[PDB]
């Protein structure tokens with residue numbers, strides 16, 4: 340059909356920063372995660388490498404995508420697809436050519452796909468403050484991130500969903516550990532330590548990059564997926580602005596729930612006292628730029644255009660304040 344033709348055209352940009360992910364979400368019948376993951380697996384020849392039956396891959400992806408919430412403005416299947424695609428581009432950076440094994444690549448992409456599954460659209464702190472079942476289950480420690488992993492892995496046990504059925508026991512064990520390490524590293528409470536470790540690696544860099552032990556390799560993959568998670572402000576402005584609209588809607592809905600419960604409204608969650616532009620500038624200045632500038636240093640000069648875009652977008656948001 341004409342719609343499938345346009346979808347195919349948009350997917351030709353799967354290896355490019357700035358893919359039209361929202362268009363792909365609409366054109367695919369709200370299956371951005373499934374089609375983008377399928378496309379990336381085909382591009383990297385992962386189905387052949389790991390003997391993943393095509394029908395099994397699609398069944399699992401659709402099932403996984405179904406577990407992202409349709410009514411959460413930001414932490415939905417589009418965000419998952421975007422992080423998957425951004426990770427895919429970061430993995431292809433020239434400075435990392437031939438550094439990671441096929442299993443490591445698979446782990447990073449799979450981790451990206453499941454990293455926010457079944458997100459309720461409220462933060463770890465909200466879950467902790469409201470004595471939620473999730474916080475009680477996970478003892479207030481990386482509550483959501485533990486849950487995303489539990490769901491992502493559990494779904495593999497559904498009928499015709501085990502995409503790792505042909506991996507060896509050793510490969511399955513290794514992949515499981517890497518995926519857990521990567522998704523737990525997406526908790527923002529770990530951001531400062533992750534960044535500190537990334538800077539230490541840049542300072543002791545040996546060169547393409549030379550990573551010999553699990554600690555260094557996993558650290559890079561953790562930071563890579565974390566960069567993808569924090570990549571919105573580095574994308575072309577039309578995409579960035581949509582991500583900002585969505586995160587603010589989600590935050591405002593949390594603030595509304597907090598207000599209904601008589602709780603104090605969390606930072607940036609009060610629709611009656613918000614500064615969207617100032618908040619984006621602060622977000623870039625204190626979190627996004629420090630991380631991306633460090634990533635850019637590790638893979639210099641591969642990420643120069645991404646960092647330039649980030650800086651341009653920071654200047655644009657800042658210009659709307661006066």
Ligand SMILES: COc1ccc(C(=O)Nc2c(Cl)cncc2Cl)cc1OC1CCCC1
Nearest residue numbers: 525527568569571582583586607618619622
């Ligand atoms: C497009 O703007 C934003 C996008 C993403 C996030 C953000 O914190 N994402 C995130 C969250 Cl909410 C939790 N764990 C990890 C990540 Cl990366 C935060 C954003 O803006 C901040 C939050 C509200 C205003 C500043």
Ligand SMILES: [Mg+2]
Nearest residue numbers: 454455483525
């Ligand atoms: Mg998350």
Ligand SMILES: [Zn+2]
Nearest residue numbers: 418454455568
């Ligand atoms: Zn995320």
